[PDB]
């Protein structure tokens, strides 16, 4: 495809120039669920950016003769699991403490549970959240505290033994590339006939798109100019809108169906540039950085960093020993309001961690050009809006980039260390260096973020002689274009309201135990659409694994649903829907969606019954077999726990907060 330039420059002129191109098909699609172009999906967003002095979004002057976008539509109306769910709730609820209150609280989740799918006609209103004012930089004192915070994490990573080195171009040959690549969507190369990132023909294109930087770098070390493409090469991103269970909202008396969350599909060429540069720093933070959420998993010991934080702040008690509180930041539309200012701090910090020091003059120069492009493509993306036309987007962080967890996590962490350095400087006699020194000792074990998901102990602000102010905190993130909902930012001292990534922790007599709200289940089961009754049986069993049989109410409920689906999971076929269920469970429990993990999960779920003892064996730390034989002393306590002793215990220990919300 060769692009053509349009006449105008203003978004309102460019909009009207686009109506003449409407009705075009994707051309890789026949039927009614195909894609058509509709410039009117832009109307709302163009209008919103008229009133902005620096909008995040511009219509691109270059357009293609056919869209690349895919069509689609709504999902199965049928919700075959909520019938057994309400029935089984009725049976189990009787055994709880308040059986009519349990039923009331469940109907809220069950009645508001839906499912979202890719459909460009449902998707375009989501893009309006990404249309706001840009924030290319911040003011004096903010930048001071922010760079002060980068040196907090500079020190943390070195103390946690960062020894990360830049790869050589050796590792860009096809077979060495295969190492750092992971099974994903092949982007705009799905039109040449590909379906994964690990196609042997794609791995070629990726390997070329990395070596091409060598010529340039050689040039740049002869004091010559690099090629022009180093400053221009832009790749096309595609938009999607994810298939996930998402909840309806009852705004003003109507059941507003859920607006699909936004997905990007970065060219595998961008994926290789990111992987080559920042894979080794990601998988270092994953393994050794107490504040790096990503890689978090509910079971098999993959929740170490969540529990460390909590067992440091609670020292065996059900409420903190000091007054010191826990903070759980609710930031609205993180992915849409991730600005340029913060993306810059986060990815620059991540590139520092890499040791360039073993690099040739040509090699240094070459990595320099790779990083220049990667940084640029991180700050300004060429996206095909679900109208079918191309759009310039200046810096957001939607899911589907290699960087989405890496950069959003590093960003939320810099925000709170940055906010706290900025308070310390203005409110006490601490210097910038003075505060950054105290926090580098403090933050090991008192902060953890997984994108917008954030949990930290007030001990952070204590070693500065301050108390956490959710009001001064929202002001700081105001400086970056982020809205901290002070009403929903949970501050507490009660173990039962401490929550990271939807998971709670309940102190049993012999140890801590991970768990999940009852809402989440009842809304996911209420939203699951009709699949082959086998794949739906697998779903219930994937849920059962998710909850690691901690709650005997949840196990009782799920066991009923499971039994009500009278099919045989034995020798079930790897349909595509069944492989989806296995892949997800193998990501949360193993970390890899690899074969020998998919098999471990397949063998586990395709047994005649899944008993609570097995599920509780997910608690006991590992590192194939999903389940083991040994229960932790705390798991074994929960095994001997009935629905009635559970409801008693949570009531006596003031831990009923783990059951709802």
């Amino acid at each position: 495809a060769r692009a053509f330039r349009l006449k105008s420059y203003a978004d309102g002129d460019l909009l009207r120039e686009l109506r003449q191109f409407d009705g075009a098909k994707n051309a890789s699609e026949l039927g009614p669920r195909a894609f058509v172009r509709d410039s009117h999906r832009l109307d709302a967003a163009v209008e919103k950016a008229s009133k902005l002095t620096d909008p995040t979004f511009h219509i691109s002057q270059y357009q293609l003769p056919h869209p690349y976008s895919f069509g689609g539509g709504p999902p199965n109306p049928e919700r075959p699991l909520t019938a057994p769910l309400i029935s089984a709730i009725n049976k189990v609820s009787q055994r709880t403490r308040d059986p009519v209150g349990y039923r009331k609280r469940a109907k809220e989740s069950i009645d508001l549970g839906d499912f979202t799918t890719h459909d460009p006609d449902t998707l375009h209103p989501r893009f309006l959240e990404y249309v706001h004012e840009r924030t290319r930089s911040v003011d004096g004192p903010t930048d001071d505290a922010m760079r002060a915070a980068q040196t907090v994490f500079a020190r943390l990573w070195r103390r946690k033994g960062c020894k990360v080195k830049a790869r050589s171009l050796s590792d860009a040959q096809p077979d060495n590339l295969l190492a750092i690549i992971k099974k994903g969507s092949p982007g705009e190369y799905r039109s040449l006939g590909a379906e994964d990132r690990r196609d042997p023909r794609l791995i070629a294109t990726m390997s070329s798109s990395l070596l091409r930087y060598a010529s340039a770098g050689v040039q740049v070390a002869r004091g010559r100019p690099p090629p022009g493409w180093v400053d221009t090469t832009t790749q096309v991103t595609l938009t999607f809108g994810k298939r996930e269970p998402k909840a309806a909202k009852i705004v003003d008396g109507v059941r507003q169906a859920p607006v699909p969350r936004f997905i990007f599909n970065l060219s595998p060429v961008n994926y290789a540039l990111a992987s080559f540069l920042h894979y080794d720093i990601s998988h270092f933070l994953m393994d050794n950085d107490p504040t790096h959420g990503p890689g978090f998993g509910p079971g098999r010991g993959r929740a170490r960093k969540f529990m460390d934080l909590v067992e440091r702040a609670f020292d065996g008690r059900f409420s903190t020993p000091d007054g010191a509180r826990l903070i759980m930041s609710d930031i609205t539309k993180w992915d849409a309001n991730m600005c340029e200012a913060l993306i810059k701090y986060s990815i620059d910090l991540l590139e520092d961690a890499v040791d360039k020091s073993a690099l040739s003059p040509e090699g240094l120069a070459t990595r320099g050009l790779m990083y220049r492009v990667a940084r640029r493509q991180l700050l300004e993306k060429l996206v095909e809006h679900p109208a079918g036309y191309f759009v310039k987007l200046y810096g957001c962080m939607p899911s589907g980039s290699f960087y989405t967890s890496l950069v959003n996590t590093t960003g939320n962490n810099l925000l709170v260390i940055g906010h706290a350095i900025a308070r310390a400087v203005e409110e006490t006699s601490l210097t910038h260096h003075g505060a950054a020194e105290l926090l580098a000792d403090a933050v090991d074990g008192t902060l953890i973020s997984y994108g917008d998901n954030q949990l930290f102990s007030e001990h952070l602000f204590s070693v500065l002689g301050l108390a956490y102010d959710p009001e001064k905190h929202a002001e700081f993130l105001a400086r970056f274009g982020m809205k901290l909902k002070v009403d929903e930012t949970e501050v507490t001292v009660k173990l039962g309201r401490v929550r990271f990534c939807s998971r709670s922790l309940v102190r049993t007599p012999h140890g801590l135990l991970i768990t999940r709200s009852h809402n989440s289940l009842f809304a996911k089961l209420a939203g699951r659409p009709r699949h082959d009754p086998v794949v739906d049986k697998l779903y219930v069993r994937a849920m059962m694994v998710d909850h690691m049989g901690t709650d005997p109410i949840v196990y009782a409920i799920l066991n009923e649903i499971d039994r009500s689906l009278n099919v045989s999971l034995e020798a079930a076929g790897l349909t595509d829907a069944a492989k989806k269920v296995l892949e997800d469970t193998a990501q949360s429990m193993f970390g890899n969606r690899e074969q020998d993990a998919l098999l471990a999960v397949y063998r586990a779920l395709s047994e005649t019954v899944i008993d609570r003892r097995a599920l509780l064996s997910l608690h006991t730390p590992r590192d194939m077999h999903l389940f083991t034989g040994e229960l932790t002393p705390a798991a074994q306590w929960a095994y001997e726990c009935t629905v009635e002793k559970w409801c008693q215990y949570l009531h006596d220990t003031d831990q009923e907060g783990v059951m709802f919300d």
Side-chain angles (χ1 to χ4, degrees), residues 1 3-6 8-24 26-29 31-103 105-106 109-162 164-181 184 186-189 193-194 196-248 250-251 253 255-303 305-316 318-593 595-606 608-622 624-661:
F4 59 88
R5 189 192 204 187
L6 295 158
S8 325
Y9 290 85
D11 293 329
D13 305 336
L14 281 161
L15 185 58
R16 318 160 173 162
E17 251 206 297
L18 288 166
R19 317 282 197 206
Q20 34 159 334
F21 299 103
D22 275 3
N26 169 233
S28 324
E29 251 175 319
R33 264 201 211 222
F35 188 73
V36 291
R37 289 183 133 155
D38 192 328
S39 42
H40 286 273
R41 322 207 172 102
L42 277 169
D43 278 56
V46 169
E47 175 99 29
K48 185 191 192 178
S50 73
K51 314 152 210 332
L52 307 182
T53 49
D54 208 1
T56 37
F57 143 85
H58 274 327
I59 311 195
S60 172
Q61 223 193 351
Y62 291 85
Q63 298 297 338
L64 279 173
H66 305 292
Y68 287 177
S69 283
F70 302 121
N76 229 307
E78 303 205 65
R79 301 295 142 94
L81 264 41
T82 89
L85 190 270
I86 69 133
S87 190
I89 278 191
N90 293 335
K91 207 207 232 213
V92 198
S93 62
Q94 293 278 73
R95 316 182 38 196
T96 74
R97 222 150 157 79
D98 189 5
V100 279
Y102 190 90
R103 280 177 249 131
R105 255 279 213 182
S109 324
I110 303 162
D111 292 354
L112 267 199
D114 223 296
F115 194 89
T116 63
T117 56
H118 173 48
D119 171 346
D121 266 294
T122 86
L123 179 75
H124 68 75
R126 169 80 29 180
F127 188 78
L128 292 137
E129 296 147 16
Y130 296 71
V131 182
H132 54 105
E133 290 280 341
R134 292 173 72 166
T135 319
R136 324 170 100 138
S137 81
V138 278
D139 59 83
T142 310
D143 167 77
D144 282 15
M146 286 308 292
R147 286 178 299 104
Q150 295 181 315
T151 43
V152 184
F153 292 92
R155 259 182 221 109
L156 184 62
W157 299 347
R158 274 192 299 253
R159 296 182 187 160
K160 311 303 280 218
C162 187
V164 180
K165 309 234 164 49
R167 325 182 69 91
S168 50
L169 279 176
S170 324
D171 298 309
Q173 314 294 347
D175 323 286
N176 299 96
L177 246 200
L178 256 178
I180 61 197
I181 309 305
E188 81 262 25
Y189 293 81
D196 201 69
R197 253 169 214 137
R198 305 179 90 143
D199 260 293
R201 321 140 42 211
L202 247 194
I203 290 287
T205 324
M206 298 167 75
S207 177
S208 316
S209 88
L210 283 171
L211 300 172
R212 48 159 183 182
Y213 288 94
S215 321
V218 166
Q219 290 284 288
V220 163
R222 272 101 203 250
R224 294 168 141 272
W229 62 263
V230 185
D231 287 57
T232 77
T233 180
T234 184
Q235 312 271 333
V236 47
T237 313
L238 278 163
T239 43
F240 281 133
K242 24 191 151 193
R243 305 186 87 260
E244 52 166 346
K246 244 191 71 142
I250 40 61
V251 201
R255 211 180 164 266
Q256 252 64 61
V259 200
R261 219 135 57 87
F262 227 61
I263 305 284
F264 283 9
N265 200 17
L266 270 303
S267 185
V269 174
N270 184 247
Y271 194 90
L273 190 63
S275 288
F276 186 82
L277 293 168
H278 308 91
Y279 173 86
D280 43 64
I281 191 44
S282 199
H283 284 241
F284 161 73
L285 301 182
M286 277 188 190
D287 302 352
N288 310 281
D289 173 36
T291 67
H292 203 65
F296 173 86
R300 291 172 46 95
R302 306 188 53 84
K305 335 175 92 152
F306 178 32
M307 299 197 305
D308 186 56
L309 200 152
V310 153
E311 200 64 273
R312 271 171 111 121
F314 280 89
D315 290 308
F318 306 104
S319 195
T320 49
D322 39 63
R325 299 173 291 163
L326 274 86
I327 329 290
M328 274 143 287
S329 310
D330 213 280
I331 298 112
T332 325
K333 316 294 171 25
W334 181 272
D335 292 17
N337 298 336
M338 190 69 165
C339 54
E340 319 179 66
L342 192 56
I343 289 177
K344 279 173 217 164
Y345 289 117
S346 305
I347 197 185
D348 289 347
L349 167 53
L350 293 158
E351 179 57 19
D352 262 39
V354 199
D355 197 18
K356 274 90 56 189
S357 85
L359 281 194
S360 34
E362 279 98 12
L364 208 31
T366 306
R367 179 142 179 119
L369 298 169
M370 295 194 182
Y371 180 73
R372 163 194 312 184
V373 182
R375 195 171 184 287
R376 163 158 65 82
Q377 293 196 8
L378 215 42
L379 297 158
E380 168 178 12
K381 323 152 202 306
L382 193 74
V383 201
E384 213 198 71
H385 189 270
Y389 303 117
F390 283 108
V391 152
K392 263 176 281 278
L393 187 69
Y394 297 106
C396 310
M397 211 44 147
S399 323
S401 185
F402 168 89
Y403 288 117
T404 299
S405 276
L406 181 63
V407 170
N408 279 338
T409 292
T410 308
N412 214 9
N413 277 345
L414 283 170
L415 276 184
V416 65
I417 298 299
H419 163 242
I421 287 171
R423 273 195 61 184
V425 166
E426 196 202 15
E427 270 150 72
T428 80
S429 52
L430 280 159
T431 88
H432 276 106
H433 188 90
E437 267 272 81
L438 279 166
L439 293 177
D441 271 16
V443 73
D444 191 319
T446 58
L447 165 74
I448 192 183
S449 302
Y450 193 137
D452 61 349
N453 255 266
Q454 177 171 65
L455 170 84
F456 64 93
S457 182
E458 192 164 18
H459 291 141
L460 261 187
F461 287 70
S462 287
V463 308
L464 296 184
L466 308 171
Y468 173 75
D469 200 338
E471 211 33 79
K472 310 186 179 203
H473 183 209
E475 191 256 338
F476 195 86
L477 323 183
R479 308 190 212 172
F480 284 90
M482 319 263 197
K483 206 252 172 313
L484 189 98
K485 321 172 85 34
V486 296
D487 42 279
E488 304 221 59
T489 294
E490 180 96 20
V491 174
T492 39
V493 287
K494 249 192 274 193
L495 191 54
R497 328 221 87 99
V498 162
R499 256 193 270 309
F500 181 61
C501 298
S502 319
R503 317 213 105 99
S504 320
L505 264 167
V506 47
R507 192 172 302 280
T508 79
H510 306 115
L512 265 174
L513 213 57
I514 278 195
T515 183
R516 223 194 210 233
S517 44
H518 291 204
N519 321 68
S520 62
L521 242 194
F522 305 155
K524 278 175 159 202
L525 290 173
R528 177 63 163 185
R530 170 97 274 182
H531 294 86
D532 163 38
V534 153
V535 184
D536 278 356
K537 190 178 169 81
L538 276 188
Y539 192 68
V540 173
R541 297 193 167 179
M543 282 339 289
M544 273 176 24
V545 167
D546 196 35
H547 281 60
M548 296 148 67
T550 315
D551 220 296
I553 319 187
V554 153
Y555 178 67
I557 282 151
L558 288 173
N559 208 29
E560 227 76 58
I561 299 181
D562 182 55
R563 284 192 169 136
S564 100
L565 298 150
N566 224 26
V567 278
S568 36
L569 287 189
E570 200 226 329
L574 259 206
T575 75
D576 289 332
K579 200 176 324 162
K580 252 292 291 173
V581 185
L582 307 190
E583 269 177 358
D584 301 332
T585 325
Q587 264 273 329
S588 73
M589 310 289 321
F590 286 101
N592 42 88
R593 24 171 41 91
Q595 212 189 51
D596 40 65
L598 293 203
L599 256 167
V601 175
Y602 176 85
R603 296 188 219 237
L605 300 189
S606 62
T608 325
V609 295
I610 307 205
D611 45 288
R612 214 201 170 198
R613 202 212 151 71
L615 295 167
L616 275 156
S617 88
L618 292 170
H619 281 274
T620 87
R622 231 60 53 84
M624 252 193 260
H625 276 280
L626 183 61
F627 300 137
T628 38
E630 252 266 2
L631 293 209
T632 41
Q636 183 71 51
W637 179 89
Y639 189 11
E640 322 176 314
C641 215
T642 73
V643 176
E644 296 85 4
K645 186 185 161 179
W646 185 246
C647 293
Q648 194 58 47
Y649 182 89
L650 304 187
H651 184 278
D652 304 338
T653 57
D654 199 356
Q655 270 169 146
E656 266 162 340
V658 308
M659 253 186 296
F660 276 107
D661 278 346

